[PDB]
Amino acid sequence: ARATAGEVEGSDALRMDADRAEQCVDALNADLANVYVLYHQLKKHHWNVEGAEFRDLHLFLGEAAETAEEVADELAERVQALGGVPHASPETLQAEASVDVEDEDVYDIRTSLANDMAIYGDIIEATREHTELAENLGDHATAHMLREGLIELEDDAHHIEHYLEDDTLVTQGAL
Amino acid sequence: ARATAGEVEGSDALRMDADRAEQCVDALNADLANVYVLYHQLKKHHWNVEGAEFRDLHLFLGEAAETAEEVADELAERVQALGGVPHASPETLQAEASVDVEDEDVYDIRTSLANDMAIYGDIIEATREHTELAENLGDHATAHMLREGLIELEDDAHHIEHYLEDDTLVTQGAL
Amino acid sequence: ARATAGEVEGSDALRMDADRAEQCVDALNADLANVYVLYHQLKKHHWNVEGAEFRDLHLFLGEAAETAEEVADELAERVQALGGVPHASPETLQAEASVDVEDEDVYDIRTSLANDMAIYGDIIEATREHTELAENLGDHATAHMLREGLIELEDDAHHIEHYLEDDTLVTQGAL
Amino acid sequence: ARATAGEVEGSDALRMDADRAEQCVDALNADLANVYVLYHQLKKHHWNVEGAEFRDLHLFLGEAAETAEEVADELAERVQALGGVPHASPETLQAEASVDVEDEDVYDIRTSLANDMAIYGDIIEATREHTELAENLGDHATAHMLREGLIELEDDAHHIEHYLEDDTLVTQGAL
Amino acid sequence: STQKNARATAGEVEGSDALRMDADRAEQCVDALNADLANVYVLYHQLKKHHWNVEGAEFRDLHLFLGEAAETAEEVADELAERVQALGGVPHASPETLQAEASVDVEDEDVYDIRTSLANDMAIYGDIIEATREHTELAENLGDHATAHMLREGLIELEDDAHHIEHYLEDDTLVTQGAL
Amino acid sequence: ARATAGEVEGSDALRMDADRAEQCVDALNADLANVYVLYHQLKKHHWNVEGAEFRDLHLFLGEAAETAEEVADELAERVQALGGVPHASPETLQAEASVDVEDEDVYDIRTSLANDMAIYGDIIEATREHTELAENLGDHATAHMLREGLIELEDDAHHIEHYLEDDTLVTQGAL
Amino acid sequence: STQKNARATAGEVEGSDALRMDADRAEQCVDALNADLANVYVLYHQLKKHHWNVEGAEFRDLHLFLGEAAETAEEVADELAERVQALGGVPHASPETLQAEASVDVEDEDVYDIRTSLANDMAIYGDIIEATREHTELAENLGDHATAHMLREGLIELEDDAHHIEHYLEDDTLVTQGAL
Amino acid sequence: ARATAGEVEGSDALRMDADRAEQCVDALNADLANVYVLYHQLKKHHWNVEGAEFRDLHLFLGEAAETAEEVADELAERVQALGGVPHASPETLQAEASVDVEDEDVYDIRTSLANDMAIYGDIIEATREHTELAENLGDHATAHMLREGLIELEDDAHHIEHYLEDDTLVTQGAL
Amino acid sequence: ARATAGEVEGSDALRMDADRAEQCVDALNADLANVYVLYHQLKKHHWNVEGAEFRDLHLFLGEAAETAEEVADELAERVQALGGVPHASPETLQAEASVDVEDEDVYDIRTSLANDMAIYGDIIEATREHTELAENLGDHATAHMLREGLIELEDDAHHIEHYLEDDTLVTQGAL
Amino acid sequence: STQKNARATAGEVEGSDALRMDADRAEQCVDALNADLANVYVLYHQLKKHHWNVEGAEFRDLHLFLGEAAETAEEVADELAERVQALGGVPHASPETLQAEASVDVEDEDVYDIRTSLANDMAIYGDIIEATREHTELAENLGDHATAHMLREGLIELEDDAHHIEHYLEDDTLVTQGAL
Amino acid sequence: ARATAGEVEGSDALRMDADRAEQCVDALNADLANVYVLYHQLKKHHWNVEGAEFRDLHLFLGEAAETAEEVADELAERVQALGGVPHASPETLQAEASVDVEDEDVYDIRTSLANDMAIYGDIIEATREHTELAENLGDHATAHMLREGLIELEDDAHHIEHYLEDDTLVTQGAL
Ligand SMILES: [Fe+3]
Ligand SMILES: [Fe+3]
Ligand SMILES: [Fe+3]
Ligand SMILES: [Fe+3]
Ligand SMILES: [Fe+3]
Ligand SMILES: [Fe+3]
Ligand SMILES: [Fe+3]
Ligand SMILES: [Fe+3]
Ligand SMILES: [Fe+3]
Ligand SMILES: [Fe+3]
Ligand SMILES: [Fe+3]
Ligand SMILES: [Fe+3]
Ligand SMILES: [Fe+3]
Ligand SMILES: [Fe+3]
Ligand SMILES: [Fe+3]
Ligand SMILES: [Mg+2]
Ligand SMILES: [Mg+2]
Ligand SMILES: [Mg+2]
Ligand SMILES: [Mg+2]
Ligand SMILES: [Mg+2]
Ligand SMILES: [Mg+2]
Ligand SMILES: [Mg+2]
Ligand SMILES: [Mg+2]
Ligand SMILES: [Mg+2]
Ligand SMILES: [Mg+2]
Ligand SMILES: [Mg+2]
Ligand code: NA
Ligand code: NA
Ligand code: NA
DSSP states (O other), rough: OOTTTTOOBBHHHHHHTTHHHHHHHHHHHHHHHHHHHHHHHHHHHHOOOOSTTTTHHHHHHHHHHHHHHHHHOOOOOHHHHHHHOOOOOOHHHHHHOOOOOOOSSOHHHHHHHHHHHHHHHHHHHHHHHHHHHHHTTTOOOEEEEEHHHHHHHHHHHHHHHHHHHSSOSOOOOTT | OOOTTTOOBBBBTBBBBBHHHHHHHHHHHHHHHHHHHHHHHHHHHHHHSSSTTTHHHHHEEEEEEEEHHHHHHHHHHHHHHHOOOOSSSSSHHHHHSSSSSOOSSOOHHHHHHHHHHHHHHHHHHHHHHHHHHHHTTTTTHHHHHHHHHHHHHHHHHHHHHHTSSSSSOOTTTOO | OOOOOOOOOOBBBBOHHHHHHHHHHHHHHHHHHHHHHHHHHHHHHHHHHHHHHHHHHHHHHHHHHHHHHHHHHHHHHHHHTTOOOOOOOHHHHHHHSSOOOOOOOOOOOHHHHHHHHHHHHHHHHHHHHHHHHHHHHHOHHHHHHHHHHHHHHHHHHHHHHHHHHSOOOTTTTTT | OBOOOTTTOOOOTTTTTTTHHHHHHHHHHHHHHHHHHHHHHHHHHHHOOOOHHHHHHHHHHHOOOHHHHHHHHHHHHHHHTTOOOOOOHHEEEEHHSSSSSOOEEEEBHHHHHHHHHHHHHHHHHHHHHHHHHHTTTTTTTHHHHHHHHHHHHHHHHHHHHHHHHSOOOOOOTTO | OOTTSSSTTTOOOOOOOTBBOOOHHHHHHHHHHHHHHHHHHHHHHHHHHHHOOSSTTTHHHHHHHHHHHHHHHHHHHHHHHHHHTTOOOOOOOHHHHHHHHOOOOOSSBBOOOOOOHHHHHHHHHHHHHHHHHHHHHHHHHOOOHHHHHHHHHHHHHHHHHHHHHHHSSSOOSSSOOTTO | OOOOOOOOBBTTTTTBOHHHHHHHHHHHHHHHHHHHHHHHHHHHHHHHHSSSHHHHHHHHHHHHHHHHHHHHHHHHHHHHHHTTOOOSSSHHHHHHOOSSSOSSSSHHHHHHHHHHHHHHHHHHHHHHHHHHHHHHHHHHHHHHHHHHHHHHHHHHHHHHHHSSOOOOOOTTTOH | OOSSSSSSOOTOOOBBBBTBBBBHHHHHHHHHHHHHHHHHHHHHHHHHHHHHHOOSSSHHHHHHHHHHHHHHHHHHHHHHHHHHTTTTTTOSHHHHHHHHOOOOOOOOOBBBOOHHHHHHHHHHHHHHHHHHHHHHHHHTTTTTHHHHHHHHHHHHHHHHHHHHHHHSSOOOOOOOTTTO | OBBBBTOOOOBBBBBBBBBHHHHHHHHHHHHHHHHHHHHHHHHHHHHHSSTTHHHHHHHHHHHHHHHHHHHHHHHHHHHHTOOOOOOOOOHHHHHHHOOOOOOOBBOOHHHHHHHHHHHHHHHHHHHHHHHHHHTTTTHHHHHHHHHHHHHHHHHHHHHHHTSSSSOOOOOOTTO | OBOOOOOOOOOOOTTTTTHHHHHHHHHHHHHHHHHHHHHHHHHHHHHHHOTTTHHHHHHHHHHHHHHHHHHHHHHHHHHHHTTTOOOOSHHHHHOOSOOOOOOOOOOOHHEEEEEEEEHHHHHHHHHHHHHHHHHHHTOOHHHHHHHHHHHHHHHHHHHHHHTTTSSSSOOTTTT | OOOOSBBBBTTOOEEEETTTHHHHHHHHHHHHHHHHHHHHHHHHHHHHHHHHOOOOOTHHHHHHHHHHHHHHHHHHHHEEEEHHHHHOOOOOOOOOHHHHHHOSOOOSSBOOHHHHHHHHHHHHHOOOOOOOHHHHHHHHHTOOOHHHHHHHHHHEEEHHHHHHHHHHHSSSOOOOOOOO | OOBOOTTTOOOOTTBBOHHHHHHHHHHHHHHHHHHHHHHHHHHHHHHHSSSTTHHHHHHHHHHHHHHHHHHHHHHHHHHHTTTTOOOHHHHHHHHOOOOOOOOOSBOOOOOOOOHHHHHHHHHHHHHHHHHHHHHEEEEEHHHHHHHHHHHHHHHHHHHHHHTSSSOOOTTTTOO
């Protein structure tokens, strides 16, 4: 093999020694796994959402999945740039994720969104810790990328929170 | 000062004597104040809307706010073109507005929309009267601008009316 | 749960009874799993590719991954439309996939591309058989969707074949 | 009411307790009020600017106003996301603003721009302090959002500085 | 009549049966629109002159503005001429004809400073703006709501450019004696 | 039913009582029926046009049909906004139309275009009268919408007139 | 075999292992696609000729149409040639080869009137359309659904252009003896 | 006056002495006058064209007029750049033009186009002479500009020649 | 026949007598034949290119073919404009071409590109001679067109030269 | 002071009152940014050299990459220079000055093979990347969060291009001895 | 080394012998050095411009710098294409430039622009000489490229001349 899973070489081009690079990679690889499980669960909810609000939700969840995909790509490319091996196979990504993943049954949209919000929250807390890590290691490019991703993730988590809030235009009358 | 609040000079370039220009300015400045309070309340509702329909509403209210902003800009530039001084500070705009403005608490989305619909209705009635005024003064450019704005305002007010209507895809079952 | 994994309800809107739909869904879900494994492995190779041709390959592989992701989305949405439950979690996708997936080490580019070429071939052969199945059930929309995906998959597979062919501009002199 | 002005609930989605969120919200709402006063005063100057440079200034000021409006929208949405109530009505915005606002007369362009420059400086100094507050609370998304706005605000402030500098192409000969 | 070489004779107005506008009504509108057309094309040509020739400390901003103003005038002229033709008239066409039929004042061929140039343009705009207002009322009074609408759409663009010129001429500036 | 055909409720949002709205709706619904007949006949002529000029005419007629469809949409939406019920089914549209409609045979292009020209004229004359009705009721938005449509209708009608005029580049020599 | 100068010999077909298409199946498809390619490139070149040379009262509309039709034919040729290559064959390439392998009738180098020119094109389209229909059935019968799909996507574009030519030739016109 | 019609100052920026510049200016001004007469007559023909081919011609003539306008602008700007005064007023442009201009009657389209073809030919011949003049003076930018314009004018003239050619799809049968 | 292959009539619109036009036409037709052979061979190489660099080459060769097609179109249109008949059928174009064309076997990419380079060089030399011819006849539009085409052909020929140069990133190590 | 010909003297730093940045703080930031600017403009010019001169089997892909990399460097230089000026300093300007003030190693004027060329570029990137990291900490420590933000936005683009070069130099390839 | 600074090999692809190519290369390299000094000084003036007209100038100078950069790129690529070595390092470009470069102090804008005007004039004169050189060598692509660049440089030089002219809208009154 050209590279072995779990090894971190650092980078001469980026002037990152293997020691610092390994600490960053460890964090970024853990995030990658969670963000890809998030991407797949968002896809699931995008595909399956039904009912009175479904089309708006389908569009939102599709866009949220594309965001998660792009964050994943950034995390993975950074892992590779730092001389690591990004988690790749679906079985690896899920095994390495710490978040909870739905079983293969389809739940109602409130349950589904609440499950996703939990995932977001875990990723958000982790990402805040990892940005601090990167900045303390002097890896400002990593810290900056993590913040650029964090803002997009927090926006989506916030949207979910709002979808679940106890207000509606619907009245008893209209029923 | 270069110009004093409340004074109207007219315009030699536009061949509008100060007498006619003052009548138009008086109407346009009153509209400007109401339309900017409308813009700020729409922004408020855009920011705060929550629940099952929130994202569609957030997008609608954002777009409705941008429309109000553009109408305000047009009214203000016309005031200035006619040799007047458009109402400018936030405190002035609200003091000069005749419409009701919500206090700083956040109301549920039905209440919030109903409050906005009332504002629209007042602006719509006023704008119809002001277009007639402008045309009777021979200020056809003003009358035309007012109509171009009126159609956009009536479209948004109509959308609000529809959001509040007593129909829904939701059934008791789905609850 | 709202739907149980493996169940196929058909669709009243699409006038497809569950019996007929089930045959199509079993094919499309098998394809979905293989295509998402392909997507993840193309992403791996996109992230990790190095050497004299790497940027052209990085771009190709990224585009190929996007094509796979879009085909997956189409298959999953068709499953759902026919009253099925698309495979969703990463562990399910890999478990339900028939194709071979690389272990987590990184291999040289010729090895990597050859591995991908084998996955394409598997999917292309299956898709051919599934288009016939769909047309024999009278599900012309599914058969049409399969063909539109098949052509894009064959194009990428054919590109891989060309990348591995025994020609080059490079000479011993230039070495 | 659904939310009472001044209250800060935090956010479960964003994993920010109310205590922590409240510190951030008090800063962001203070900034919001100053930025919306800035927006309205830039609009004033956009509408009223006259003379030899007026079209270039009209365009600059209009773009600057759009930047302010976007920064305001970001601040307000962040307040709401953290479980706060963004200042909304014009009278509230001006009352909660710390910066100085022109009276309703129109001043010459150098005076007007100098007044705006002072508002920018106030906001820029506050935003610097608020980014540090956010980062010290571990609210990296807020701190990142503050910096993205800060750079655009500094750019406009710097433009104003250049407009007021003691150089020109004009000569006594050309007069 | 069947042997005339011309397809239409300048100054005649036939109305339109497609548009259900009789020739009597159409003739009143065409008289107005053709007069406007001549003035707008003189404006266009003078804006072009000023666009080409403007120099000095603000010249690039003015060059861009004047070019955009000329394009606007060209577009309004096109609309007026096409409306004359739609109503069964003959739009004034040759440059000599357009200037002969124009009521506005044209600069001679020497080049003047920018303040003079813009003030001369401002006077043209004003004359056109007053006439357009009159012609909009004429069209609405005859029930030709499409012409009235078209005139208003043009008027707002011409007023905006007239207003910009008024602003360029105003007595304010960033320049100070100390910068000089 | 939610609304009964022929009923006009007015609108609270738009501050139009039913009495006033009804006058406008009766005009707009009559126009709607004629414009949709026009749309269908332009489509017919678009589909069937043949000969030396057919492609230019096919494109013109298709664009003209799109214009008619947009005018119809505007009229129908205004009817609904004023609390009316827009004519909807094809049989209703043709029954409520005052203009003449071709039988199902295909006629030569001059005949076809002349038939369309007559429909345009009818609609143009009515629209002129309806804009006056709207303005006399103080419904300036409706009157403005009517004028914006009228100009596009007159443009297409005028094109037809030119297509039928007695000139051509063709000579006996070229024959 | 290891010492041949050519990388591939014209007329041989190797199939594809990437595409899981054996050479026997691939050869039947390639025979069909190459024949189509030759006819489509002759069509392309004749459409170009007519685009360049068209004159008279309708010439600009026809010039645009014929240019668009040629671009369509060029695109279909590209797809057919790339499919031949994907299936392990050698697409016909040189102009002499393309015309030699084409079954359709080509105009000689003189320029004919537009009605003649379009009628000659119409005959080419028709021949290609009938063959493409046959080849789509051939591909689907061999299980080469991607080739069949590609052929259908091409066929609809070629049919649309053939139909336009049929319309241009139809016996109607706005022109009247009185306009003449 | 800043500059007198007929003065040619040359340019220090462009390193063109007044003697060389004057030769170019006289040529360019001659061309400007002709090109603007061409513009006005193309407009005339665009406005008035009627009959079986009118829409295609209306479009072509509008585009040809656009091209003539852009050539005139380039000619005039170059005059000014070389320190001369471009011909400006409509009366001056027609007086200074050497080509024949139609009287104010409207002619049939064949006559109209033949008149335009003659103007084009005169301009084309002159432009070829002026390009040679420019190159002989070492004014390669002028020469290049003249050629860039020439190619566009030749293309339009060529189109007119083709419209007038003795071919058509029309048959006596169709008549 | 309307025109006989080999007749050159010149143009009254372009004020080009048949004697001058014929000299240009013969030159342009020669170039047209060569450029279309070049197009067909670039297509061939685009379709067939294989190996480590094939995708970059496939793209380059497709673009080079596009450029050759556009040059041929300009050449042919100019022939026609000058009153000649452009070479049209595939057999005629190859017969009239002076450059060498590959037989129908597929060669390796270095051989293929070297064959193309030779065609380019022949065309480039001819085009330079033809530009001088055109300018000497006073046909400046032809000369300008030829140069606009020449620069694009030279750029493509230059690229081929670079692809064939004796450098690479590949090392014996990588092999 | 009132009689100096220069408007600003190279090496002086005045801070900004608009930006509420005193001269002492601003001077530390400007020293850093100007040093970066010089290195980034040397990088830009060497990327341009390599873009122009690259040849061989991968040259077109590298030509495109190097052109894009140079545009990135140009953009970063622009941002650094404009920030120096905003903080009341004088950005290094002339080519001689930029290279004199640059700490990185510049190739001599001969042309080297692509592997050598890219390795020389890689060394420049690395030096700039290490300094930029230092300067981001400097800016944040002084409370100049906008400069820090700007530096990070630049750093990520420069790191991406440095990483691409690292990949181009890696010891893998599709090429095989059999293809040779 | 692959090529030595100062070697000129010509090109077999472009059919340009080293003797002819060397004459062009020397000319183009001279121009490249001057154009890059011009670029750097335009950048300088873009960065530093202050005062009443600064934003318009900042924009103009940025665009002029862009144009100079693109001309330099074309010059350098042509050098390389002809088998020479383009001047590359900043020190080499300034050493090889014949134009005067400002010292590192910042001058007022009139002085700055006058310095730039002088550089433009020197380049314009040289470029005219080089175009003639190229055409005399039969290198028509070089000649054409030089003219395409010349026209853009002349336009920018002309703008600078206009900015420096003795006119303004400013009056003593406004002061
Ligand atoms: Fe990626
Ligand atoms: Fe505005
Ligand atoms: Fe989807
Ligand atoms: Fe399709
Ligand atoms: Fe918002
Ligand atoms: Fe950012
Ligand atoms: Fe027009
Ligand atoms: Fe609609
Ligand atoms: Fe409008
Ligand atoms: Fe292709
Ligand atoms: Fe211009
Ligand atoms: Fe050009
Ligand atoms: Fe063409
Ligand atoms: Fe810049
Ligand atoms: Fe380049
Ligand atoms: Mg690596
Ligand atoms: Mg004013
Ligand atoms: Mg479902
Ligand atoms: Mg909330
Ligand atoms: Mg007519
Ligand atoms: Mg309703
Ligand atoms: Mg192959
Ligand atoms: Mg001048
Ligand atoms: Mg001809
Ligand atoms: Mg400064
Ligand atoms: Mg070389
Ligand atoms: Na390679
Ligand atoms: Na000024
Ligand atoms: Na015809």
